[PDB]
Amino acid sequence: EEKDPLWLYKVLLTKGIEVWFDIKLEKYGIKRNNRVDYIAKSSLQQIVFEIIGKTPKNIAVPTYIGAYEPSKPEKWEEEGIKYINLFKPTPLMKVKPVKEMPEIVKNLLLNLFDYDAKSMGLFINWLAFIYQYKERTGVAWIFMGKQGTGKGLLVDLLKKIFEEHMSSNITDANLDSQFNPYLYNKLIVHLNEVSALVKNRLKTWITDETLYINRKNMKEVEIKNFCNFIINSNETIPVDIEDSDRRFNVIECNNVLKEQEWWTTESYQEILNNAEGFAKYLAGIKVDRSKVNEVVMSEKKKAIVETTESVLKQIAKALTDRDIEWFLDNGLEGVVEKNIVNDFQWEELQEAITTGVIPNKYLMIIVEQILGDSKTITWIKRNIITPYQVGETTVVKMAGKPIRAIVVG
Protein backbone atom coordinates (compact mmCIF):
# COMPACT_ATOMS: atom_id res chain seq x y z
CA GLU A 1 0.00 0.00 0.00
CA GLU A 2 2.92 2.42 0.85
CA LYS A 3 5.03 4.07 -1.91
CA ASP A 4 7.92 5.20 0.35
CA PRO A 5 9.00 3.51 3.68
CA LEU A 6 11.13 6.54 4.75
CA TRP A 7 9.07 9.59 3.61
CA LEU A 8 8.67 10.86 7.20
CA TYR A 9 12.43 10.49 7.92
CA LYS A 10 13.21 12.70 4.99
CA VAL A 11 10.53 15.33 5.67
CA LEU A 12 11.86 15.66 9.19
CA LEU A 13 15.46 15.92 7.85
CA THR A 14 14.16 18.77 5.63
CA LYS A 15 13.31 20.46 8.95
CA GLY A 16 16.65 19.58 10.63
CA ILE A 17 15.32 16.67 12.79
CA GLU A 18 16.79 13.16 12.35
CA VAL A 19 14.50 10.38 13.57
CA TRP A 20 15.22 6.66 13.70
CA PHE A 21 14.05 3.49 15.45
CA ASP A 22 16.74 2.10 17.69
CA ILE A 23 16.29 -1.66 17.41
CA LYS A 24 18.78 -2.16 20.31
CA LEU A 25 16.82 0.02 22.76
CA GLU A 26 13.42 -0.47 21.07
CA LYS A 27 12.99 3.26 21.44
CA TYR A 28 12.67 5.93 18.79
CA GLY A 29 15.68 8.22 18.70
CA ILE A 30 15.58 11.89 17.68
CA LYS A 31 18.35 14.40 16.89
CA ARG A 32 18.05 18.24 16.70
CA ASN A 33 20.66 20.95 17.22
CA ASN A 34 23.20 18.36 18.50
CA ARG A 35 20.84 17.16 21.32
CA VAL A 36 20.00 13.40 21.15
CA ASP A 37 16.90 12.03 22.91
CA TYR A 38 15.18 8.61 22.99
CA ILE A 39 11.44 8.57 23.14
CA ALA A 40 8.60 6.04 23.07
CA LYS A 41 6.42 5.87 19.98
CA SER A 42 3.47 7.93 21.29
CA SER A 43 5.87 10.70 22.26
CA LEU A 44 7.26 10.71 18.70
CA GLN A 45 3.81 10.68 17.18
CA GLN A 46 3.15 13.83 19.32
CA ILE A 47 6.31 15.52 17.95
CA VAL A 48 5.56 14.47 14.38
CA PHE A 49 1.99 15.87 14.66
CA GLU A 50 3.25 19.28 15.75
CA ILE A 51 5.70 19.41 12.76
CA ILE A 52 3.61 18.07 9.80
CA GLY A 53 0.00 18.29 11.11
CA LYS A 54 -0.72 14.53 10.52
CA THR A 55 -0.44 11.65 12.93
CA PRO A 56 0.46 8.67 10.77
CA LYS A 57 -0.29 5.18 12.07
CA ASN A 58 3.10 4.09 10.65
CA ILE A 59 6.37 5.79 11.63
CA ALA A 60 8.22 5.87 8.30
CA VAL A 61 11.80 5.98 9.54
CA PRO A 62 14.93 3.89 9.27
CA THR A 63 16.00 1.27 11.78
CA TYR A 64 19.52 2.03 13.01
CA ILE A 65 21.51 1.13 16.09
CA GLY A 66 22.54 4.15 18.14
CA ALA A 67 26.19 3.96 19.25
CA TYR A 68 28.53 6.35 21.05
CA GLU A 69 31.61 6.13 18.82
CA PRO A 70 33.38 9.48 19.04
CA SER A 71 35.97 8.81 16.31
CA LYS A 72 33.40 7.42 13.84
CA PRO A 73 31.17 9.59 11.57
CA GLU A 74 27.50 10.64 11.94
CA LYS A 75 26.64 7.16 10.55
CA TRP A 76 28.31 3.95 9.35
CA GLU A 77 27.82 0.29 8.72
CA GLU A 78 29.83 -2.49 10.28
CA GLU A 79 29.24 -5.84 8.64
CA GLY A 80 25.71 -5.32 7.45
CA ILE A 81 24.29 -3.29 10.35
CA LYS A 82 23.46 0.36 9.99
CA TYR A 83 24.64 2.42 12.99
CA ILE A 84 23.91 6.04 13.94
CA ASN A 85 26.09 8.10 16.28
CA LEU A 86 25.12 9.37 19.75
CA PHE A 87 28.39 11.32 20.10
CA LYS A 88 27.99 14.97 19.02
CA PRO A 89 31.00 17.22 19.79
CA THR A 90 30.36 20.12 22.18
CA PRO A 91 31.36 23.70 21.10
CA LEU A 92 34.74 23.76 22.76
CA MET A 93 35.61 20.35 21.28
CA LYS A 94 35.35 21.87 17.80
CA VAL A 95 37.86 24.72 18.36
CA LYS A 96 41.03 25.94 16.61
CA PRO A 97 44.45 24.62 17.85
CA VAL A 98 46.87 26.85 19.78
CA LYS A 99 50.26 26.34 21.47
CA GLU A 100 49.95 28.74 24.48
CA MET A 101 47.79 27.86 27.48
CA PRO A 102 45.90 30.74 29.18
CA GLU A 103 48.15 32.10 31.91
CA ILE A 104 45.67 32.07 34.82
CA VAL A 105 44.65 28.51 33.80
CA LYS A 106 48.39 27.62 33.76
CA ASN A 107 48.81 28.95 37.31
CA LEU A 108 45.94 26.66 38.44
CA LEU A 109 47.59 23.66 36.83
CA LEU A 110 50.99 24.63 38.26
CA ASN A 111 49.53 25.19 41.69
CA LEU A 112 47.77 21.82 41.49
CA PHE A 113 50.81 19.64 40.62
CA ASP A 114 52.90 21.72 43.10
CA TYR A 115 54.83 23.05 40.03
CA ASP A 116 56.12 19.57 39.04
CA ALA A 117 56.41 19.67 35.21
CA LYS A 118 56.88 15.89 34.88
CA SER A 119 53.49 14.80 36.26
CA MET A 120 51.64 17.97 35.23
CA GLY A 121 52.75 17.53 31.62
CA LEU A 122 51.83 13.89 31.77
CA PHE A 123 48.27 14.92 32.84
CA ILE A 124 48.04 17.38 29.98
CA ASN A 125 49.17 14.56 27.62
CA TRP A 126 46.43 12.39 29.10
CA LEU A 127 43.86 15.18 28.95
CA ALA A 128 44.84 16.05 25.44
CA PHE A 129 44.53 12.43 24.26
CA ILE A 130 41.04 12.24 25.78
CA TYR A 131 40.10 15.59 24.18
CA GLN A 132 41.66 14.73 20.81
CA TYR A 133 41.56 11.00 20.21
CA LYS A 134 38.49 10.46 22.51
CA GLU A 135 39.32 6.93 23.69
CA ARG A 136 39.70 5.09 26.96
CA THR A 137 43.14 5.64 28.46
CA GLY A 138 43.35 2.83 30.93
CA VAL A 139 44.74 5.22 33.54
CA ALA A 140 43.03 7.38 36.18
CA TRP A 141 44.08 10.35 38.22
CA ILE A 142 43.47 10.80 41.91
CA PHE A 143 43.82 14.31 43.24
CA MET A 144 43.92 14.29 46.99
CA GLY A 145 44.77 16.83 49.63
CA LYS A 146 42.95 19.69 51.28
CA GLN A 147 40.00 21.61 49.81
CA GLY A 148 40.44 24.83 47.86
CA THR A 149 43.49 23.52 46.04
CA GLY A 150 41.41 23.91 42.79
CA LYS A 151 40.66 20.19 42.35
CA GLY A 152 37.00 21.15 42.21
CA LEU A 153 37.81 24.10 39.97
CA LEU A 154 39.68 21.82 37.54
CA VAL A 155 36.49 19.75 37.47
CA ASP A 156 34.24 22.75 36.63
CA LEU A 157 36.84 23.93 34.08
CA LEU A 158 36.85 20.57 32.28
CA LYS A 159 33.06 20.17 32.76
CA LYS A 160 32.59 23.35 30.85
CA ILE A 161 34.78 21.84 28.24
CA PHE A 162 33.38 18.38 27.90
CA GLU A 163 29.90 19.45 28.75
CA GLU A 164 27.65 16.45 28.83
CA HIS A 165 30.46 14.02 28.00
CA MET A 166 31.62 14.30 31.54
CA SER A 167 30.02 13.36 34.83
CA SER A 168 30.74 15.40 37.86
CA ASN A 169 30.91 14.78 41.61
CA ILE A 170 29.66 11.21 41.47
CA THR A 171 29.49 9.84 45.03
CA ASP A 172 29.26 6.48 46.73
CA ALA A 173 25.49 7.09 46.88
CA ASN A 174 25.24 7.33 43.08
CA LEU A 175 27.02 3.97 42.81
CA ASP A 176 24.60 2.29 45.26
CA SER A 177 21.85 3.50 42.95
CA GLN A 178 20.70 0.69 40.70
CA PHE A 179 20.93 2.95 37.66
CA ASN A 180 24.22 4.32 36.40
CA PRO A 181 23.71 6.91 33.66
CA TYR A 182 26.88 8.69 34.93
CA LEU A 183 28.74 6.16 32.69
CA TYR A 184 26.42 6.39 29.58
CA ASN A 185 28.22 8.29 26.93
CA LYS A 186 31.05 9.80 28.96
CA LEU A 187 34.56 10.48 28.10
CA ILE A 188 35.37 11.68 31.56
CA VAL A 189 33.85 10.59 34.88
CA HIS A 190 34.66 12.48 37.99
CA LEU A 191 34.20 11.11 41.51
CA ASN A 192 34.17 12.81 44.85
CA GLU A 193 35.24 10.74 47.83
CA VAL A 194 33.56 12.38 50.76
CA SER A 195 33.15 10.47 54.00
CA ALA A 196 36.30 11.07 55.96
CA LEU A 197 36.05 1.09 49.84
CA VAL A 198 33.08 0.66 47.32
CA LYS A 199 34.91 2.49 44.49
CA ASN A 200 37.20 -0.56 43.94
CA ARG A 201 34.76 -1.45 41.09
CA LEU A 202 36.07 1.52 39.26
CA LYS A 203 39.41 -0.33 38.92
CA THR A 204 37.82 -2.56 36.26
CA TRP A 205 35.82 0.31 34.60
CA ILE A 206 39.16 2.00 33.77
CA THR A 207 40.24 -0.94 31.63
CA ASP A 208 37.04 -2.81 30.66
CA GLU A 209 36.29 -2.80 26.91
CA THR A 210 32.54 -2.51 27.73
CA LEU A 211 30.11 -1.53 30.48
CA TYR A 212 26.52 -2.56 31.37
CA ILE A 213 24.21 0.47 31.52
CA ASN A 214 21.07 0.26 33.59
CA ARG A 215 18.98 3.39 33.01
CA LYS A 216 15.49 4.01 34.28
CA ASN A 217 12.71 3.12 31.83
CA MET A 218 15.36 1.78 29.40
CA LYS A 219 16.65 -1.74 28.77
CA GLU A 220 19.87 -2.84 30.42
CA VAL A 221 22.30 -2.47 27.64
CA GLU A 222 25.94 -3.20 27.11
CA ILE A 223 28.04 -0.48 25.48
CA LYS A 224 31.59 0.25 24.42
CA ASN A 225 33.46 2.01 27.20
CA PHE A 226 34.95 5.53 26.64
CA CYS A 227 35.34 6.40 30.27
CA ASN A 228 38.27 8.06 31.84
CA PHE A 229 38.28 8.61 35.56
CA ILE A 230 39.34 11.43 37.88
CA ILE A 231 38.79 11.16 41.61
CA ASN A 232 38.82 14.02 44.03
CA SER A 233 39.55 13.19 47.57
CA ASN A 234 40.52 14.91 50.72
CA GLU A 235 43.16 12.87 52.53
CA THR A 236 41.10 9.71 52.42
CA ILE A 237 42.29 6.86 50.22
CA PRO A 238 39.38 6.16 47.89
CA VAL A 239 40.64 2.91 46.37
CA ASP A 240 42.82 -0.02 47.56
CA ILE A 241 46.12 0.57 45.65
CA GLU A 242 48.25 -2.58 45.02
CA ASP A 243 52.05 -2.09 45.32
CA SER A 244 52.67 -2.86 41.65
CA ASP A 245 49.82 -0.68 40.31
CA ARG A 246 49.38 0.44 36.69
CA ARG A 247 45.99 2.29 36.79
CA PHE A 248 46.35 5.21 39.22
CA ASN A 249 48.37 8.40 39.13
CA VAL A 250 48.10 10.07 42.55
CA ILE A 251 48.73 13.74 43.11
CA GLU A 252 48.63 15.22 46.62
CA CYS A 253 47.94 18.96 46.47
CA ASN A 254 47.86 21.05 49.63
CA ASN A 255 48.60 24.43 47.99
CA VAL A 256 45.41 26.26 48.94
CA LEU A 257 44.62 28.85 46.24
CA LYS A 258 43.56 31.63 48.67
CA GLU A 259 47.11 31.47 50.18
CA GLN A 260 48.87 32.31 46.85
CA GLU A 261 50.01 35.71 45.63
CA TRP A 262 48.22 35.48 42.27
CA TRP A 263 44.78 34.69 43.72
CA THR A 264 42.29 37.56 43.34
CA THR A 265 38.50 37.21 43.83
CA GLU A 266 37.84 37.27 40.06
CA SER A 267 40.47 34.51 39.60
CA TYR A 268 37.88 31.72 40.27
CA GLN A 269 35.58 33.01 37.55
CA GLU A 270 38.44 34.21 35.23
CA ILE A 271 39.72 30.64 35.11
CA LEU A 272 36.30 29.38 33.92
CA ASN A 273 35.96 32.12 31.25
CA ASN A 274 39.27 30.78 29.80
CA ALA A 275 37.76 27.31 29.27
CA GLU A 276 37.81 28.01 25.52
CA GLY A 277 41.47 29.06 25.79
CA PHE A 278 42.33 25.80 27.61
CA ALA A 279 40.30 23.82 25.06
CA LYS A 280 42.24 25.48 22.24
CA TYR A 281 45.52 24.58 24.02
CA LEU A 282 44.50 20.93 24.49
CA ALA A 283 43.49 20.70 20.82
CA GLY A 284 46.95 21.87 19.80
CA ILE A 285 48.96 19.36 21.86
CA LYS A 286 51.13 16.89 19.95
CA VAL A 287 50.20 13.72 21.77
CA ASP A 288 52.85 11.22 22.81
CA ARG A 289 50.65 8.09 22.64
CA SER A 290 53.03 5.99 24.81
CA LYS A 291 52.91 8.47 27.76
CA VAL A 292 49.07 8.52 28.03
CA ASN A 293 48.82 5.27 29.95
CA GLU A 294 52.05 5.95 31.92
CA VAL A 295 51.86 6.03 35.71
CA VAL A 296 54.37 7.19 38.27
CA MET A 297 55.21 6.41 41.84
CA SER A 298 54.48 9.82 43.33
CA GLU A 299 55.44 10.36 46.98
CA LYS A 300 51.76 10.00 47.94
CA LYS A 301 51.15 6.82 45.99
CA LYS A 302 54.09 5.25 47.92
CA ALA A 303 52.78 6.37 51.32
CA ILE A 304 49.35 4.92 50.41
CA VAL A 305 50.85 1.57 49.40
CA GLU A 306 53.15 1.17 52.45
CA THR A 307 50.11 1.77 54.71
CA THR A 308 47.64 -0.32 52.67
CA GLU A 309 49.89 -3.38 52.36
CA SER A 310 49.86 -5.92 55.20
CA VAL A 311 52.60 -5.71 57.83
CA LEU A 312 52.87 -9.52 57.69
CA LYS A 313 53.66 -9.25 53.97
CA GLN A 314 56.34 -6.68 54.84
CA ILE A 315 57.87 -9.01 57.40
CA ALA A 316 57.83 -11.93 54.99
CA LYS A 317 59.44 -9.81 52.27
CA ALA A 318 62.19 -8.79 54.69
CA LEU A 319 62.69 -12.49 55.51
CA THR A 320 62.73 -13.34 51.79
CA ASP A 321 65.06 -10.44 50.84
CA ARG A 322 67.30 -11.46 53.81
CA ASP A 323 66.99 -7.76 54.67
CA ILE A 324 68.21 -7.12 58.23
CA GLU A 325 68.13 -3.33 57.66
CA TRP A 326 64.33 -3.33 57.51
CA PHE A 327 64.03 -5.16 60.85
CA LEU A 328 66.45 -2.70 62.45
CA ASP A 329 64.53 0.21 60.83
CA ASN A 330 61.45 -1.26 62.58
CA GLY A 331 63.15 -1.42 65.98
CA LEU A 332 64.43 -5.01 66.26
CA GLU A 333 67.52 -3.64 68.09
CA GLY A 334 65.08 -3.29 71.06
CA VAL A 335 65.53 -7.03 71.68
CA VAL A 336 69.02 -6.19 73.10
CA GLU A 337 67.81 -3.28 75.29
CA LYS A 338 65.17 -5.36 77.15
CA ASN A 339 67.57 -8.37 77.64
CA ILE A 340 65.33 -10.78 75.77
CA VAL A 341 68.68 -11.82 74.23
CA ASN A 342 72.44 -11.44 75.07
CA ASP A 343 75.32 -10.06 72.91
CA PHE A 344 76.24 -13.55 71.66
CA GLN A 345 72.69 -14.58 70.65
CA TRP A 346 72.04 -11.17 69.00
CA GLU A 347 74.90 -11.95 66.55
CA GLU A 348 73.32 -15.39 65.86
CA LEU A 349 69.90 -13.68 65.35
CA GLN A 350 71.17 -11.14 62.81
CA GLU A 351 73.30 -13.83 61.07
CA ALA A 352 70.08 -15.91 60.88
CA ILE A 353 68.06 -13.28 59.02
CA THR A 354 70.86 -12.54 56.53
CA THR A 355 71.81 -16.19 55.92
CA GLY A 356 68.05 -16.88 55.67
CA VAL A 357 68.18 -19.70 58.16
CA ILE A 358 66.07 -18.90 61.24
CA PRO A 359 65.70 -21.02 64.36
CA ASN A 360 62.19 -21.22 65.75
CA LYS A 361 63.17 -19.50 69.00
CA TYR A 362 64.69 -16.60 67.01
CA LEU A 363 61.74 -16.37 64.58
CA MET A 364 59.37 -16.01 67.54
CA ILE A 365 61.71 -13.47 69.16
CA ILE A 366 61.82 -11.41 65.93
CA VAL A 367 58.06 -11.49 65.23
CA GLU A 368 57.22 -10.74 68.88
CA GLN A 369 59.55 -7.79 68.78
CA ILE A 370 58.38 -6.28 65.50
CA LEU A 371 54.68 -6.77 66.20
CA GLY A 372 54.55 -6.09 69.98
CA ASP A 373 53.06 -9.31 71.36
CA SER A 374 54.21 -12.94 71.15
CA LYS A 375 53.01 -15.10 68.29
CA THR A 376 53.45 -18.87 68.17
CA ILE A 377 55.43 -20.68 65.51
CA THR A 378 52.09 -22.06 64.37
CA TRP A 379 50.64 -18.58 63.87
CA ILE A 380 53.83 -17.25 62.21
CA LYS A 381 53.73 -20.22 59.83
CA ARG A 382 50.02 -19.81 59.02
CA ASN A 383 50.08 -16.02 58.78
CA ILE A 384 53.59 -15.20 57.39
CA ILE A 385 55.83 -18.07 56.22
CA THR A 386 53.14 -20.11 54.52
CA PRO A 387 50.89 -17.57 52.72
CA TYR A 388 53.88 -15.55 51.39
CA GLN A 389 55.92 -18.69 50.58
CA VAL A 390 58.90 -17.50 52.65
CA GLY A 391 60.26 -21.02 52.88
CA GLU A 392 60.03 -24.41 54.62
CA THR A 393 60.08 -25.47 58.27
CA THR A 394 62.82 -28.05 58.78
CA VAL A 395 65.71 -29.22 60.95
CA VAL A 396 69.31 -27.93 60.81
CA LYS A 397 72.13 -28.94 63.15
CA MET A 398 73.41 -25.72 64.75
CA ALA A 399 76.43 -26.42 66.89
CA GLY A 400 75.79 -30.14 67.67
CA LYS A 401 72.10 -29.90 68.64
CA PRO A 402 69.46 -30.38 65.87
CA ILE A 403 67.33 -27.21 65.71
CA ARG A 404 63.87 -26.60 64.22
CA ALA A 405 64.31 -23.72 61.79
CA ILE A 406 62.73 -21.91 58.90
CA VAL A 407 64.87 -22.03 55.74
CA VAL A 408 64.25 -19.03 53.52
CA GLY A 409 63.91 -19.52 49.76
Give alpha helix (H) positions in 113-196: 117-133, 151-162, 172-176
Contact segment (CB under 5 A) with Mg ion among 52-60, 96-104, 162-170, 327-335 equals 162-170
Torsion, Cα of 325, 328, 333, 334 (10° steps): -170
| Cβ contact 240:201 at 8 Å | no
Give min distance, CB of 184 to a copy of itself, in A.
Answer: 37
| Binding-site partner at residue 378 among a copy of itself, Mg ion, none, CB < 5 to 8 Å by type | a copy of itself
Site string for Mg ion, 168-207 (x = CB under 5 A): -x--------------------------------------
Using the rule CB under 8 A, which residue among 76, 115, 133, 379 binds a copy of itself?
379
Nearest to 92 by CA among 318, 319, 282: 282
Question: How far apart, in whole angstroms, are the C-alpha atoms of residue 320 and residue 409?
Answer: 7
CB closer to a copy of itself, 260 vs 376: 376
Give the footprint of a copy of itself on residues 96-125 (CB under 8 A). Answer: none
Residues in the chain: 409
- Which residues sit in the known binding site for DNA? 2-409
Q: CB-wise, 13 or 311, nearer to a copy of itself?
A: 311
Identity of the residue, 293 or 393, whose beta carbon is nearer to a copy of itself in the bound complex: 393
Task: Kindly write down the DSSP assignment for every residue of 132-153, as one continuous string.
Answer: HH----S-EEEEESSTTSSHHH
Rounded to a whole number of angstroms, the minimum distance from the CB of residue 389 to a copy of itself is 5
- Segment near a copy of itself (CB under 8 A), from 58-66, 177-185, 273-281, 358-366? 358-366
Closest approach, Cβ 161 to a copy of itself, in A, equals 33
Whose CA is closest to 147, among 50, 32, 235, 248? 235
Q: Is 41 helix (H, G, I), strand (E, B) or coil?
A: helix
From candidates 299, 321, 348, 351, binder to a copy of itself by CB under 8 A: 299
Q: Which does 379 bind (CB under 5 to 8 A by kind): Mg ion, a copy of itself, none?
A: a copy of itself
| Strand ranges of the sheet holding 166-170, from the earlier edge strand across to the other edge | 166-170, 188-192, 229-232, 140-144, 248-252
- Name the residue type at position 113: F
Distance, CA of 152 to CA of 119 (rounded, Å): 19
Task: Single out the residue of 4, 378, 399, 400 in contact with a copy of itself (rule: CB under 8 A).
Answer: 378
* CA angle, residues 229, 233, 236, in degrees to nearest 5: 125
Residue 376 as a binder of a copy of itself (CB under 8 A): the answer is yes
Contacts of 244 (CB under 8 A, 6+ apart): none
- Please, what is the minimum distance in Å from the beta carbon of residue 304 to a copy of itself? 8
Candidate residues 4, 79, 176, 337; the one interacting with a copy of itself per rule CB under 8 A: 337
Residue 303 touching a copy of itself (CB under 8 A): yes
- What residues are designated binding site? 2-409
Instruction: Please count the residues of this chain forming the interface with a copy of itself, following the rule CB under 8 A.
Output: 35
Nearer Cβ to a copy of itself, position 18 or 252? 252
- How many alpha carbons lie under 13 Å from residue 53 in its C-beta half-sphere? 0
Q: By CB under 8 A, is residue 243 in contact with a copy of itself? A: no
SS3 at position 95: coil
Q: If contact means CB under 5 to 8 A according to the sort of partner, which of Mg ion, a copy of itself, none does residue 199 touch?
A: none
| Subset of residues 203 to 232 that bind Mg ion, contact rule: CB under 5 A | none
Closest CA to 315 of 381, 220, 376: 381
Least Å distance between CB 327 and a copy of itself? 10
Site string for a copy of itself, 308-327 (x = CB under 8 A): ---x----------------
The string of DSSP codes covering 346-404 is: HHHHHHHHHHTEEEHHHHHHHHHHHHSS---HHHHIIIIITTTT-EEEEEEESSSSEEE
384: burial class by Cβ within 10 Å (0-12, 13-18, 19+)?
buried
Would you tell me which residues interact with a copy of itself (CB under 8 A)? 299-300, 303-304, 306-307, 311, 328-331, 333-334, 337, 360-361, 364, 370-372, 374-379, 381-383, 386-389, 393, 404
Would you tell me which residues interact with Mg ion (CB under 5 A)? 169
